Write a protein that binds this DNA or RNA. Structure first.
Ligand code: ATP
Ligand code: ATP
Ligand code: ATP
Ligand code: MG
Ligand code: MG
Ligand code: MG
Lengths: 316, 316, 316
DNA sequence: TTTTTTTTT
DNA sequence: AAAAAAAAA
């Protein structure tokens, strides 16, 4: 995709181009999707440079009203990534859609952190297999990124492990304000390359800790909203899917609607329920088989799939 | 591992270095994994000192995107500690993995407090035996730390008791807010030395008491989450394993899923189920033989091992 | 042991010292083992007084990480109290260990309320006999504290009855919320004196009644946990043993594990099974001889002893 | 917006 | 074989 260098020949001459890049801006799209107010906060582009930069960036491409069908076409390069269990891919429409945020929340031992590895391995398969020719970005917020698992699943999928463990990029976010730093940089590698999905285990494992009590709740939800917006924007201007794992909390309140089943009601509140495009609840079933329920999708209606997490990732 | 003195020659000059250390910060890593907001709460580093400190600490080492394989390598120094029963070490992949939290929960007389002593003794064995060249930190929240047992097990393992009883460090946490104080200090001794595992008998024996009733539940779960995060962080930036013993509660609710077996459903809720990387349920079997079931691991799938707690710790 | 007056000369000046004492706090240790939150609920020490009090109390003594061996030494003053039947004292390691909770549960006529008298009398013997130079605290929750029995056993042990019946302190708890009141006060007499063991016949004889039905079960288990924690703490900061008698319930459920022997499964649930350090089951044998089985100890493994309750207490 | 607890006969 | 109740930042 065109970089922030194409407009370098429009008067934007790269004296401050280093300034721009340092700010994270690497593509042209990211120049259009950045508010002026935020662009005049990078210490060296005050007012007029930003006006000329925006005039240029708009001269490259236009954002008006593509009627509806040029959209349906531009919407054809979605690369629905397979999850590994035919039933689930069928209930989701083929798998994890790209240029969108897909969230998975359930109590422990539901393998919602194993679906991450299954995707990490099943994204490097030819398009006619479910994924395709894509690297992966992985942001771990609770550890548990065992590459041994990646190699096991690769071998089980008839694929050179060494190869796959090379197309993955790993980053161990340490605290919330570092997790948010990471996405900015991530805006770079996605500028030139083939990244299909970004993965965030426990999107809120950190925020749950850096902000404790309803004394600092609002300041947490606001940071979380900014973080989720940055993601949803990346996943959109790079045709990249986003996969977030979430957690569950128990409601010590009433015994209605209905009487039981506490392993629900994810954490994050509404700021995260809205931002997520697809929601999925993973529940424990019988023996070693779990139930995946769809709860919020714009394409599908609803259903319940059953899947067993075996030795080749998520299957049945 | 490098201390917080290496950057002392970067402008951080140690005028306030005592301030920093008093705050618990002893290594450089701990400087990177501490949010600014929390660092400007130590009464003497307001804004700019923290900025320069972070610039320095980042100048020493980088945290970007190690692709995947440098990870698989850096992940090679795991020191899987043996538990003492070949079958169990085989079901866990070799034993208690380091840089991770392993939880063990079951009803009384399951010796989940005896596995602690068995580890305390079996951590000081050459790596080719299961542990290796490591001291031990022990935080007792219910008493029952009989060093006599440590000496008995040592003698049974052909090892100088006096020696082992010297490489152990003991602390009797008195109340929750003291148990949480202890880990901060513990951040110090782990700065320079050879500590392999930290042990916490009844991670929640105290929290269960300092906060009674669902009137103060949330305020308990939040403190517990902070405490568990601090641990998981220590165990990660020091290549040290963490071993927590938990307790069991009975569900006076329905008679489904299935009809019986009440000695399950540990306490702590979900805040502790997520934070734990490995879960293990210890159940009473026949005669003097117990059954260890694995329930949540990122490496293994699942299995049931059988072990007898004899006079040399946990064996068969 | 040092009182709460030693720190009186640290700024804590005794203006509110009466406030502190009224709260039960009499020693310094009890000041360290009391959470701040609970200390700012005594109506006259809000925030700063508690901070200075804790600073002082910590200035007297330190609680860090005594490595392991200073522990094995400080653990040398255990005063294992003899029970009266050589076989039982041998199966327990010498008798009832101090600074620990020992529970005894069995069906009626097992004399689990006679072992209480036997201890009451066999605690005032020179250390080389099994007990030693200790008064006794007795909390009766079902009556049946016949001092005549105490005098009979004393005479049988070659000891001045009048003397022993003076070193005993008796309290007839009337209801649960009074039984819990009693331990607080008890925290006083143990401040200055020689008390070796505390005794509680039917630790749950009252709780079984003040809270009926699973509608108020949780509120009963929580109070019981608080009560047991207070005990375990007293028994620890005063080198005093605790001896609890329990009761038995019958399981109208299945006929497995194995088919019979209903006189087991004590009451109290798990909140009491964990808190107890040593468990013992008293069963009826042949003629006038009972069988004592050990079930949960941190020192011993396991065994079955046989003892006959004769006219000199518990013997064979 | 956050946060589960507790066997009896 | 069949039994519920518990708040507070
Ligand atoms: N190769 C394997 N290694 C480890 N576990 C496996 C393997 N194959 C299957 N499993 C099983 O699959 C399940 C995986 O759980 P999973 O990783 O989804 O937990 P999680 O929900 O991601 O973690 P948490 O909920 O604690 O964040 C476990 O029950 C595990 O035992
Ligand atoms: N040397 C020994 N000393 C004491 N008990 C032993 C010994 N060897 C084996 N045992 C037995 O092993 C078991 C140990 O129980 P364990 O210490 O695991 O209880 P726990 O579950 O840790 O304690 P709790 O559940 O009360 O927190 C007991 O049944 C005990 O009798
Ligand atoms: N001097 C004595 N006076 C009374 N009974 C005695 C005496 N000596 C021996 N016994 C016998 O020893 C046994 C004592 O029973 P014990 O006092 O242990 O009952 P308990 O289990 O404590 O009470 P409960 O189970 O009702 O709470 C009885 O069988 C009793 O007849
Ligand atoms: Mg997980
Ligand atoms: Mg124990
Ligand atoms: Mg009795």
């Amino acid at each position: 995709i065109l970089s922030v260098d194409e407009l370098q020949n429009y008067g934007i001459n790269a004296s401050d181009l280093q300034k721009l890049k340092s700010g994270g801006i690497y593509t042209v799209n990211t120049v259009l999707s950045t508010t002026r107010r935020h662009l005049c906060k990078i210490k060296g582009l005050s007012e007029v440079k930003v006006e000329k930069i925006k005039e240029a960036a708009g001269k490259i491409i236009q954002v008006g009203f593509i009627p509806a069908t040029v959209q349906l076409d531009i919407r054809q390069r979605v690369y629905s990534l397979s999850t590994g269990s035919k039933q689930l891919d069928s209930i989701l429409g083929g798998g994890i859609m790209t240029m969108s945020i897909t969230e998975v929340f359930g109590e422990f031992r539901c393998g919602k952190t194993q679906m991450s590895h299954t995707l990490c391995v099943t994204t490097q398969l030819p398009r006619e297999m479910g994924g395709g020719e894509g690297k992966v970005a992985y942001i771990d917020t609770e550890g548990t990124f065992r590459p041994e698992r990646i190699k096991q699943i690769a071998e089980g999928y008839e694929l050179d492990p060494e190869s796959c463990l090379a197309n993955v990029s790993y980053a161990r976010a340490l605290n919330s304000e570092h997790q948010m730093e990471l996405v900015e940089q991530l805006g770079e590698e996605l500028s030139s390359g083939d990244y299909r999905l970004i993965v965030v285990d426990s999107i809120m494992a950190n925020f749950r800790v850096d902000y404790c009590g309803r004394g600092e709740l609002s300041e947490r939800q606001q940071k979380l909203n900014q973080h989720l917006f940055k993601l949803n924007r990346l996943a959109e201007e790079f045709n990249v899917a986003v996969f977030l794992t979430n957690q569950v909390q128990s409601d010590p309140g009433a015994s209605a609607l209905f009487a039981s089943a506490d392993g629900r009601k994810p954490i994050g509140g509404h700021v995260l329920a809205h931002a997520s495009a697809t929601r999925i609840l993973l529940r424990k079933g019988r023996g070693d088989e779990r139930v995946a329920k769809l709860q919020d999708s714009p394409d599908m209606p609803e259903k319940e799939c059953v899947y067993v997490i075996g030795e080749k990732g998520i299957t049945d």
